[PDB]
Ligand binder design. Sequence first.
Ligand SMILES: Cc1cc2nc3c(=O)[nH]c(=O)nc-3n(C[C@H](O)[C@H](O)[C@H](O)COP(=O)(O)OP(=O)(O)OC[C@H]3O[C@@H](n4cnc5c(N)ncnc54)[C@H](O)[C@@H]3O)c2cc1C
Ligand SMILES: Cc1cc2nc3c(=O)[nH]c(=O)nc-3n(C[C@H](O)[C@H](O)[C@H](O)COP(=O)(O)OP(=O)(O)OC[C@H]3O[C@@H](n4cnc5c(N)ncnc54)[C@H](O)[C@@H]3O)c2cc1C
Ligand SMILES: Cc1cc2nc3c(=O)[nH]c(=O)nc-3n(C[C@H](O)[C@H](O)[C@H](O)COP(=O)(O)OP(=O)(O)OC[C@H]3O[C@@H](n4cnc5c(N)ncnc54)[C@H](O)[C@@H]3O)c2cc1C
Ligand SMILES: CCCCCC/C=C\CCCCCCCC(=O)O[C@H](COC(=O)CCCCCCC/C=C/CCCCCCCC)COP(=O)(O)OC[C@H](O)CO
Ligand SMILES: CCCCCC/C=C\CCCCCCCC(=O)O[C@H](COC(=O)CCCCCCC/C=C\CCCCCCCC)COP(=O)(O)OC[C@H](O)CO
Ligand SMILES: CCCCCC/C=C\CCCCCCCC(=O)O[C@H](COC(=O)CCCCCCC/C=C\CCCCCCCC)COP(=O)(O)OC[C@H](O)CO
Lengths: 404, 404, 404
Amino acid sequence: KEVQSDVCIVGAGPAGMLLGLLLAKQGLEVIVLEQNGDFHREYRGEITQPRFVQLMKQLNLLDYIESNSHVKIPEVNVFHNNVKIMQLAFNTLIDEESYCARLTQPTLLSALLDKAKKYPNFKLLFNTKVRDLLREDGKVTGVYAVAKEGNLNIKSRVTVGVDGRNSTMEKLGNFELELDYYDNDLLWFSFEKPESWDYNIYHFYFQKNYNYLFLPKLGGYIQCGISLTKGEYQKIKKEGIESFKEKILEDMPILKQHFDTVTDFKSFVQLLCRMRYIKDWAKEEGCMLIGDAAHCVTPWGAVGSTLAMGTAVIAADVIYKGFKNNDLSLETLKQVQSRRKEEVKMIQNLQLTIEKFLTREPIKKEIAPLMFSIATKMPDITNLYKKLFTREFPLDIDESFIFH
Amino acid sequence: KEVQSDVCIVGAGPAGMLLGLLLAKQGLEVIVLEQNGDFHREYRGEITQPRFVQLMKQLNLLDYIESNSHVKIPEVNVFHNNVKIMQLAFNTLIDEESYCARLTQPTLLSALLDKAKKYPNFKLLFNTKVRDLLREDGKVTGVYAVAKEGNLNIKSRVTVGVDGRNSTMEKLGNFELELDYYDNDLLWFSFEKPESWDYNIYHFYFQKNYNYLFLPKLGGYIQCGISLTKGEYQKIKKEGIESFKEKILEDMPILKQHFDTVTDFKSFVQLLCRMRYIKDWAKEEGCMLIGDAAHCVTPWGAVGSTLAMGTAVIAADVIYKGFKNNDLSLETLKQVQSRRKEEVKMIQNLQLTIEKFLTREPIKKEIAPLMFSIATKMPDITNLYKKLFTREFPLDIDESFIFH
Amino acid sequence: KEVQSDVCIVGAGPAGMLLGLLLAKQGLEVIVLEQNGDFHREYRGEITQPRFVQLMKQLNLLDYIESNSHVKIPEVNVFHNNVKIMQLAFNTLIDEESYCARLTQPTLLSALLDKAKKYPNFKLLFNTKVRDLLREDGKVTGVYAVAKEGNLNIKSRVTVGVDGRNSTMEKLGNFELELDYYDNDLLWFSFEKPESWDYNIYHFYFQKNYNYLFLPKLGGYIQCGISLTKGEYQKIKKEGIESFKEKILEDMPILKQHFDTVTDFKSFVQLLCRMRYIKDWAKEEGCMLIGDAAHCVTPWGAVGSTLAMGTAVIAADVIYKGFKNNDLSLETLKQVQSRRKEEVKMIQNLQLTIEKFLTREPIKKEIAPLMFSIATKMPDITNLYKKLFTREFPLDIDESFIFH
Ligand SMILES: Cc1cc2nc3c(=O)[nH]c(=O)nc-3n(C[C@H](O)[C@H](O)[C@H](O)COP(=O)(O)OP(=O)(O)OC[C@H]3O[C@@H](n4cnc5c(N)ncnc54)[C@H](O)[C@@H]3O)c2cc1C
Ligand SMILES: Cc1cc2nc3c(=O)[nH]c(=O)nc-3n(C[C@H](O)[C@H](O)[C@H](O)COP(=O)(O)OP(=O)(O)OC[C@H]3O[C@@H](n4cnc5c(N)ncnc54)[C@H](O)[C@@H]3O)c2cc1C
Ligand SMILES: Cc1cc2nc3c(=O)[nH]c(=O)nc-3n(C[C@H](O)[C@H](O)[C@H](O)COP(=O)(O)OP(=O)(O)OC[C@H]3O[C@@H](n4cnc5c(N)ncnc54)[C@H](O)[C@@H]3O)c2cc1C
Ligand SMILES: CCCCCC/C=C\CCCCCCCC(=O)O[C@H](COC(=O)CCCCCCC/C=C/CCCCCCCC)COP(=O)(O)OC[C@H](O)CO
Ligand SMILES: CCCCCC/C=C\CCCCCCCC(=O)O[C@H](COC(=O)CCCCCCC/C=C\CCCCCCCC)COP(=O)(O)OC[C@H](O)CO
Ligand SMILES: CCCCCC/C=C\CCCCCCCC(=O)O[C@H](COC(=O)CCCCCCC/C=C\CCCCCCCC)COP(=O)(O)OC[C@H](O)CO
């Protein structure tokens, strides 16, 4: 059918969903579309940042978010050859409360949906794959989508895409990619937590054969990612499962119990560490790109979700200002990028610098952990930690967006 | 009065001058405006790069330029506490001709002008500072300038600004700065060459107090740049000339003879190591920013002039193609940036990495040279050399640009 | 025959000898057996630590030992390509007197023997090589040895093995060895001291071909050790003496006068840099392994003798406590290991980290020296110096062990 509204957010991710309710409490007609059936269809990570806590307290949602199931990671540890080389507790970064949080994306999305659906002007449609844009009169008037019931021409003055790195809307509008980075990947597998370890951990190991990352998998497990170069996993698959198991157990002898029942490669998940940046997030009238669709980043420090959420809150700010001033021009849509540009670019440069440490070249794989140990012992490093984990000042938002 | 041409180039530096004649030999009408009375008025540099040799040989200009006054520099040396830690002969980078050169901008510009003025369709005006842009019918039509003898209203299909880092057309057209970096400065002074030293040198020194750069100043002298942090030269002036002289002679005792007659700071010249990148070099029809006005860089590797010249060559190719096809809109003008983007950005990122070694912070200052040594002993380092000093492939340009 | 006492110490090296007299003044019955004829038979080193001085002045023995012949080494220097990269004066590590000391093991052992022989309950037998343990009634009750006159069945409640790395009692009791490290060796030779050098030196040199160590050999000479990889010595011997001499003199031209008279490999002495750690030093009643037989280490920093002496002091404390308490079970003998474990493991890990600098691999050999320079320029290097050279707190022992 034909339904008309004010804001159409393609994608029900953590960003759009946030952008879903921030406008919903402002009295705007909001429709949020997702192609999936729910938030459980795809696993998009669990670890968050102290920046997330900062934003939740800034929006006065910290207590409501904390009431759900979560785990507080107090610090991050880096080991070299099973010897600790760096330690950083998140509570020393800012005076207020700060901590990493194992908080599943489905649970946070469910909480946001529960809070948002109390507003009648909010409509969330699942199983709705957007097909194209109603680019009419030289501007984006709405979107043509298929609901699965029928075909919808859903019109809105603003159409915002948060479709993630695998965004179809990136090419529906002529959005030019000015940064496409893909150099490494991760091999994820979950194993039962050993009794010698803690559950609330955030660990990175430099070892002889591979580099490892250990995170608190939901349910009392430990979720470990092995860092590999792009195009190296199929070489390992050809080389044989036995060699991979031997090289892993030589590096991490405690994984022997889990690998005793491992005999093949299909228990691992290949995560592609992609990073992207759109040349201009808004270039037409009524269309703009925020979230992972525009500034997706690598999962080092768990900054991607918080970055998307901050960009979504800035976009809600700009959209509300445009509605109040009756000025939703494209130059108003440039404001979102002009405000998030410094944060996003600084974060992306930090991620590039961190990814430089993951080199697996003959001499560089051996000099990287020592380089990391030198870098973490500089007196400046603390500031860098803040640049990577906290927002120095809260995002300038109107007091109307604060929840009570 | 009323002067009508095809191309109007504001700026007669090495880039525009090249763009001045590359189109001039194509048969187009070219007018080049310069505020200075000659090329000798400002000192704009001496050192070139093997990229310059590659570009000259590609255009079949190498013999003509090499017939002038130049000094071939075969290698760059780096020292730590007066002990060499790095060496690189340029002839090993590529199989063709590869060498740095001492070549003053005035003589290169004089050679280019001598070649260009033989074409009747090329005109050059000196002491003609551009004031306004003749923006009419929603597009840039020409420039209003003052010649010192009258007020000229020059009309041309293409108006190209190569004004340099201190560009007046940078704001006449609303051009945005995507990057603006300024972290260090160079204190330049020339001293007579000691008999122990060679003339065709390119030397860098990590010393106790200051880092030094030595280049062959024209006339049998040696020009030295002392690297300082931004805003630190005033502190040095306050502290006194005697302390500065003592710390300089402690680092480099060979400078004693020159400093025997230095009693004040009015002989050193301060250079601001600014690096800039324009968001989009073409944003209006009939106007464009290329060269140092768009992608000015730091003087680490002598890449600035060659980069500007390559941008000018690509711009000449694009402009000639557009004139041939009778299509000089904004879309075709936006091709120069797309064709120079990756090279310019890679060079700027390498410059940022190199400038990271110039830190004067308490702890980082003493380990920075050693880091540099570790950098120069990597197996990959030679590729980096090829990325910094040479061009992998010649510029994709039409055959009529080759001189005979 | 039949000899019955309290303590039987197999081995009369610096550790056991110390524990030989510490218990002797407690009134216990002690026999110390040594297979050698005297303390001059085997060269066991000359360099001590400030830790040794701390231990000697803790027992009120510093003035007695210092009355002998010794050379005070005030500092340790590290050079790279004949240029000093590190300096450390030991007196800045603790407020008390702190220095290294060239003190020949025969001299210290003779002083300890002279102090101990005044006690009639102390008996030392040279040329009495132990052969077996009298393990009876499910526990060790003594030793069967041969004195060169007769066969001695020595009976003692406590039997302590300090036989060293070549321990013959290491396998008499099934002592599990949980760390067997051997990666490098040292080629030792003594040469006449040049007048340009100081005698009391502790010098390390990173050079082009080999790494060198210079110590004050007794008699006004200089003891030099060339660091080599395991098994490389016989490759050098096959390659020829002349090539070895040329590569040595290229690295250290000051050695030309000594190497003018060198024409064979029979002047150098090969020392194997082994480092062992027994899993548990006490596993049954009436037997124990301490000292070099338990925690042998590499000779970097001169830590082995002081570590063995400290272990012997702790073992004497535990043995006296058990004898006074009348409790000499396995669980009270485990106290020595439980108390020395942290110190010994910290020292051994530091030795591993130091030995990592002695790599001779193609590219790693060149970045190792200036990797050493970086680590010595860290803000926390002084804590590492204190941990590697000094003891933070004195060993907790009774006043009865203090000499008067
Ligand atoms: C496999 C994986 C693992 C990750 N792990 C972590 C981690 O451990 N820690 C961390 O901090 N971050 C992690 N991330 C990143 C994190 O998920 C993102 O930063 C976050 O999702 C940002 O929100 P978003 O809405 O922009 O992205 P997404 O939530 O991924 O946006 C995509 C959403 O839009 C919908 N959609 C897409 N296209 C369409 C369309 N055409 N029509 C309709 N709906 C559409 C999808 O159904 C989905 O709901 C991970 C991401 C992935 C892909
Ligand atoms: C002190 C100094 C030293 C340098 N040393 C080196 C070096 O050793 N090596 C190296 O590789 N690079 C060096 N450079 C950089 C190098 O000079 C530039 O990168 C290069 O000239 C770029 O070419 P261009 O024509 O775009 O710039 P420019 O040479 O600056 O060209 C701009 C010209 O246009 C004129 N102009 C500006 N505005 C107007 C206007 N409104 N109307 C009319 N004319 C106008 C200017 O007067 C100037 O003549 C140095 C620069 C400086 C300032
Ligand atoms: C060549 C060399 C150079 C060294 N240089 C230094 C140095 O510069 N600085 C430093 O701090 N350390 C040095 N050391 C190490 C130092 O000698 C030992 O760490 C130290 O002696 C430890 O004390 P210990 O008595 O347990 O060892 P040792 O003195 O080696 O113990 C062996 C003793 O036990 C006796 N013994 C062994 N087996 C039997 C048996 N079956 N029956 C009877 N007696 C037996 C031997 O006769 C000898 O007296 C060096 C060692 C060597 C081999
Ligand atoms: C080399 C033979 C010995 C020569 C010395 C002779 C006798 C005595 C002097 C002993 C000095 C030994 C210095 C050891 C330095 C060292 O590695 O210690 C470290 C130094 O601290 C650092 O982490 C600083 C940077 C460390 C750099 C890596 C050092 C270990 C690596 C060795 C390999 C070197 C060759 C290169 C191989 C790899 C190339 C591909 C201890 O660190 P920590 O975490 O315990 O504490 C921090 C510290 O206090 C600084 O803040
Ligand atoms: C490797 C993955 C990391 C695993 C844990 C991830 C999760 C949490 C931990 C987060 C902490 C990460 C911080 C690492 C330190 C770091 O990036 O430092 C850097 C230090 O400075 C830099 O810019 C370093 C440049 C990039 C270094 C690349 C690493 C080189 C390693 C191996 C390849 C060897 C080839 C080079 C050898 C030559 C040496 C120079 C941050 O720089 P900055 O300018 O942003 O800030 C500087 C700072 O404030 C003080 O200098
Ligand atoms: C220093 C001023 C310039 C002096 C030279 C003058 C003229 C010409 C010579 C130019 C030679 C420049 C080469 C410098 C090395 C360099 O850029 O390498 C780098 C090597 O890798 C890096 O990114 C190194 C990190 C950047 C430098 C960090 C700053 C180090 C100094 C001080 C801060 C110390 C704390 C931070 C430590 C970080 C761990 C390394 C470029 O990386 P890449 O991936 O592009 O290339 C890899 C390469 O093949 C391996 O090295």
